[PDB]
Design a binder for this molecule. Structure first.
Ligand SMILES: CC(=O)N[C@H]1[C@H]([C@H](O)[C@H](O)COC(C)=O)O[C@@](O)(C(=O)O)C[C@@H]1O
Length: 363
């Protein structure tokens, strides 16, 4: 596998990289992102978001800083946890969490976290140049239906999707002040105007849900979400673009995530040549438990063949994760091609998994 962001050899002399992201563009360009964790693995630290772009199918890469932090605090200023999408116009949107103080985004404050915001950038030239940062949360003019009891929120970490009519849907996570406690939940946001403005959906049925992605299936949203301390990825389905949810049994509890906290993973849809819609999930098996997050695996379900059990396709990273921070992954599928980026011992690695797709596609 190619080392895409190398802690030991990179243009920022960053000590560590985390939270990778990938989009395969229609024209065969590969666009990736990662947290530049300049000072080490810590989440609560000085972080910008890098891009790496390839026009030769992942042989060589161009690097840039896609989004800088607010530069307020040289210890704690951070933009992080990229969620991305390509719209029907080809526009590339990136949404990041922004903070500049110490302490967990969800749990530190009992009121709206004062240094918190959600920052958005877009590219109209296939990720060559970006807009200025747009602040989605400083006022009420960009994101409708934000709960008054919001502590904070950011994207679900991974990729969003486009509905048939062109509506953009992004996975999100929120922290809500409820009866003297902070509870965190998954949900979605959507845009009908190419990302200019958004509406927030409602929270999923269970707290302790966070990082997630959704696919579209026949107008429904199906979510695969990190469900902390359950030992598995939860799955829910919405028939009303994220207003209401119920358990989605065929995926709920089917991907096991081992002892301790959950882990980010990715969940995408592919349509094979026989017309079957398949779901692909990347996540660590975490057989060793907690933050070890060993064995980043790829799993498959066939929505058009639900009595067939979820199958492990391959294990792109058959190694222990680094306990300081590892395990995260992102798939992208486009035009019969499949690629993954994942965390590997403080680096980001890249693999083309198209050969595995060919095995599934049968042919
Ligand atoms: C913004 C942030 O803090 N993101 C980090 C996230 C998070 O802290 C964890 O979901 C716990 O959030 C809650 C809701 O309690 O989780 C990771 O620390 C991890 O590797 O698990 C890496 C990731 O950048």
């Amino acid at each position: 596998p190619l080392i895409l962001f190398n802690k030991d050899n990179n243009i920022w002399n960053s000590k560590y990289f985390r939270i990778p992201n990938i989009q395969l563009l229609n024209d065969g360009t590969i666009l990736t992102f990662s947290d530049i964790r300049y000072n080490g693995p810590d989440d609560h630290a000085y972080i910008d978001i890098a891009s790496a772009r390839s026009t030769d199918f992942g042989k060589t890469w161009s690097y840039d800083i896609a989004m800088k932090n607010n530069r307020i605090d040289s210890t704690y200023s951070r933009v992080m946890d990229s969620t991305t999408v390509i719209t029907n116009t080809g526009r590339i949107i990136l949404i990041a969490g922004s903070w500049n103080t110490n302490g967990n985004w969800a749990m530190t404050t009992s009121t709206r976290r004062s240094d918190w915001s959600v920052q958005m950038i877009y590219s109209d030239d296939n990720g060559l140049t970006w807009s200025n940062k747009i602040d989605l949360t400083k006022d009420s003019s960009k994101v409708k239906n934000q709960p008054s009891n919001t502590i904070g929120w950011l994207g679900g970490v991974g990729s969003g999707i486009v509905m048939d009519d062109g509506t953009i849907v992004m996975p999100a996570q929120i922290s809500l002040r409820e009866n003297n406690e902070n509870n965190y939940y998954s949900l979605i946001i959507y845009s009908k105007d190419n990302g200019e403005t958004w509406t927030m959906g409602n929270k999923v049925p269970n707290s302790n849900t966070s990082e997630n992605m959704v696919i579209e299936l026949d107008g429904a949203l199906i979510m695969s979400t990190r469900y902390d301390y359950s030992g598995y990825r939860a799955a829910y389905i919405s028939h009303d673009l994220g207003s209401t949810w119920e358990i989605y049994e065929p995926l709920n509890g089917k991907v096991l995530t081992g002892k301790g906290s959950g882990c980010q993973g990715s969940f995408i849809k592919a349509t094979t040549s026989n017309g079957h819609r398949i779901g692909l999930i990347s996540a660590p098996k975490n057989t060793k438990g907690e933050y070890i997050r060993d064995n980043i695996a790829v799993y498959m379900i066939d929505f058009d063949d639900l009595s067939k059990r979820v199958q492990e396709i391959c294990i792109p990273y058959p190694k222990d994760g680094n306990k300081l921070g590892g395990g995260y992954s992102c798939l992208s599928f486009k035009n019969s091609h499949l690629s993954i980026v994942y965390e590997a011992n403080g680096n980001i690695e890249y693999q083309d998994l198209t050969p595995y797709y060919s095995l599934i596609n049968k042919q």
